[PDB]
């Protein structure tokens, strides 16, 4: 990793756990969803070692330090959605009926069904995701996809719509999809725990993929923020 090992695998579009270390740049970004250094703006160098620990490390709690994986913000059981609610919250997400059990940031906020009268407060930019699944298949489970991403980011995620009101999901070249998402922070009240832009959200997802703590049941290749 410091010299002479796996240089032929750095940036090879295939994640190799043997090369997944900060020294080898998370296998040249292949293990961090194409995010070079998710901690690039983090002021303390050893934060990634404390990212995975299930405890608050205040020195690593800044937005630049990826909120110490929300362990300072969500200190107790509220860190995760109840496993008994997994199917229920995915089935009832954004169905136009307020489901109180799902009405928490860790469960996906019920896809905002309990906050229809609160105006959208979008983060800057668009979250772009390459998923190795065709658009039709991806949209067949779109509620599950958005609910899970909303639960992970602890905020509300939705498909960016075009002028014709259609979801901005494009074919990837037959082999996958290029998914465009917006982040609605209308329920994200602020210390800090809210992504101000799409790149911040992409870096956080890259940091989870880097420490092997991203459990998203979709063939997600890469993430980026775009204006």
């Amino acid at each position: 990793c410091p010299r002479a090992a796996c240089q032929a695998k750095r940036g090879d579009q295939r994640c190799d756990r043997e090369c997944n270390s900060p020294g080898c740049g998370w296998d040249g970004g292949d293990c961090s969803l194409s995010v070079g250094d998710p901690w690039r703006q983090c002021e303390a160098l050893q934060c990634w070692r404390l990212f995975n620990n299930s405890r608050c490390d205040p020195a690593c709690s800044s937005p630049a330090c990826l909120y110490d994986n929300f362990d300072c913000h969500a200190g107790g059981r509220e860190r995760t959605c109840n496993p008994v609610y997994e199917k229920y919250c995915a089935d009832h997400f954004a169905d136009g009926r307020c489901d109180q059990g799902c009405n928490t940031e860790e469960c996906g906020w019920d896809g905002l069904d309990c906050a229809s009268e609160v105006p959208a407060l979008l983060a800057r930019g668009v979250l772009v995701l390459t998923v190795l699944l065709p658009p039709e298949e991806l949209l067949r489970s779109s509620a599950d996809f958005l609910q899970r991403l909303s639960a992970i980011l602890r905020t509300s995620l939705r498909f960016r719509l075009d002028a014709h009101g259609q979801a901005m999901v494009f074919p990837y070249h037959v082999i996958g999809s290029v998914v465009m998402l917006e982040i609605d922070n209308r329920l994200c009240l602020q210390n800090d725990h809210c992504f101000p832009d799409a790149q911040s959200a992409a870096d956080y997802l890259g940091a989870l993929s880097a420490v092997e703590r991203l459990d998203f049941p979709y063939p997600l290749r890469d993430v980026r923020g775009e204006p």
């Epitope: 299930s54 107790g76 059981r77 496993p83 008994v84 059990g101 459990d215």
Partner: antibody, heavy 119, light 108 residues
Framework: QVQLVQSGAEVKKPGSSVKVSCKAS????????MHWVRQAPGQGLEWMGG????????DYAQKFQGRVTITADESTSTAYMELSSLRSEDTAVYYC????????????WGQGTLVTVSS | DIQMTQSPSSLSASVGDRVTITCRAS??????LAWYQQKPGKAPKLLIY???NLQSGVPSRFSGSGSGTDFTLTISSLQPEDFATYYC?????????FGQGTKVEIKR
Amino acid sequence: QVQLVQSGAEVKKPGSSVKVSCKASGGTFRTYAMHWVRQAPGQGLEWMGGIVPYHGITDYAQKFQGRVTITADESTSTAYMELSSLRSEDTAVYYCARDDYSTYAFAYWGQGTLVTVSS
Amino acid sequence: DIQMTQSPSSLSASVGDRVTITCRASQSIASYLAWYQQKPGKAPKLLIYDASNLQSGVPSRFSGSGSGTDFTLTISSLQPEDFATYYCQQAYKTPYTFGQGTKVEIKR
């Protein structure tokens, strides 16, 4: 102090139904879950399903689909497990288990209810 | 389902021995793993929750470690009241699943 008290031992003929109850007391956490775990004689532990009485949301193990019904009465902090079309292989001790404010793991357990299914 | 594999299934040890029981999950469960103790004719008892948190009232000679797919229950200075069956349980995704159990007997 949290305490879980279950209904008494049951004896049933094959094809009959059983409904077991579990009363929780001493709890302060509103969104606690009540689970049903069974243990056949000399065997391990098997989760059947669970409920959060405050929200009424339930989840079951697929192998118990159609035969198990889990309900609760939030006002009495009581959970129920109903198991239908009883077979001799359903003979087991049925435990009620509850989590707490700090984990989803089974922090509290009832004393168990033996259900014997036989001719 | 997530399959939980415990090792050993049976263990003979003496009072004062340092005992290790391992639990392997079929897929990663992060740190969402609990350890239970069960004695004959009694209900299980929670010892450790979420891989490494010792339940209050449980002696400090019990400790849990691991993350991902591999977990360890360590009993330092095994005491007479520790002879029992131990189970690991993933609390990560439903259906909640348990290991097959490790029966700990006293050598004599």
